[PDB]
Design a protein around this ligand. Structure first.
Ligand code: R78
Length: 273
């Protein structure tokens, strides 16, 4: 199946099905210029009828376009034909962290700070570009062949003024800031090390009081530096939370081995030491 760009020329070849978004259908797409495979969202016009989703797809593109960073999924090109919206994105062959953590359950400390270093790197560029992610989760940390991490899915992204990790300040109807991303970051780290989030992720009104409030159990299994860092990122009030610069300079990062580079065997098997 060859896909021609009606505006510009211009030929692409679609390969294997990668999965679903949602709500989009995803495929491999080789730019024939060029000769290179991309992970691509193929969004038919048939699901984007309401003048409500059309704006949300347009926004994601608008925001993702101008992002250029080694730990941010690279936007390549978008176009559309008769059928379908085409968003061509950086191919990450090892899928995501949600995948690897399903196989592993829990990660070792050197692995955790290997992934977090890359996340904070990507999120920092994001936050300097005045853009907020608003949907940080393991499923949105894409991993390439070289075991490198890219932050992806700017579907919920917006610039400064339903997600996995609701912050207390968002639940106090004060909207989403940069510190609300740092909230998600602590949840991410907690899950990497323990394999269950610190709070319920149902987004139901019953877990709201639980996340005001920031009441959660800190397991004994966690080492002190890991414990002290998580507690900081998950502080009740947003102002008490550490800066992104503060996070990567914490004792958790300065003490301990740490790669790069990780072997991909770490996707399924637990690494030596
Ligand atoms: C474009 C959306 C998002 C994204 O933004 N980027 C950048 C991305 C970059 N790279 C990938 N890579 C792969 C993702 C999944 C698979 C895979 O194993 N899929 C299987 C196919 C056979 N099957 C029936 C079971 C599922 C392989 C990948 O590369 C080898 N996926 C990406 N996605 C995903 C696309 C579907 C949701 C998320």
């Amino acid at each position: 199946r060859i896909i021609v760009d009606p505006t510009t020329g211009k030929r692409y070849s679609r390969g294997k099905t990668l999965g679903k978004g949602g709500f989009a259908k995803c495929y491999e797409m080789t730019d024939l210029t060029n000769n290179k495979v991309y992970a691509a969202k193929i969004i038919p016009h048939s699901r984007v009828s309401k003048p409500h989703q059309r704006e949300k797809i347009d926004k994601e593109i608008e925001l993702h376009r101008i992002l250029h960073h080694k730990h941010v999924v690279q936007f390549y090109h978008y176009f559309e034909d008769k059928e379908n919206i085409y968003i061509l994105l950086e191919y990450c062959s090892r899928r995501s962290m949600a995948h690897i953590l399903k196989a592993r359950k829990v990660l070792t400390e050197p692995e955790v700070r290997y992934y977090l270093r890359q996340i904070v790197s990507g999120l920092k560029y994001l936050h300097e570009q005045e853009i907020l992610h608003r949907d940080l989760k393991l499923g949105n940390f894409f991993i390439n062949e070289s075991m490198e991490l890219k932050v992806g899915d700017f579907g919920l992204a917006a610039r400064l003024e339903t997600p996995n990790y609701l912050s207390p300040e968002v639940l106090n109807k004060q909207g989403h800031g940069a510190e609300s991303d740092i909230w998600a970051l602590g949840c991410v780290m907690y899950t990497m090390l323990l394999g269950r989030p610190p709070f319920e992720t149902t987004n139901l009104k019953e877990t709201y009081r639980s996340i005001r409030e920031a009441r959660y159990t800190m397991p004994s299994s966690l080492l002190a530096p890991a414990k002290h860092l998580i507690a900081s990122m998950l502080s009740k009030n947003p102002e008490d939370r550490p800066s992104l610069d503060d996070i990567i300079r914490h004792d958790f990062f300065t003490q301990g081995f740490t790669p790069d580079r990780l072997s991909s065997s770490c996707c399924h098997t637990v690494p030596d030491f």
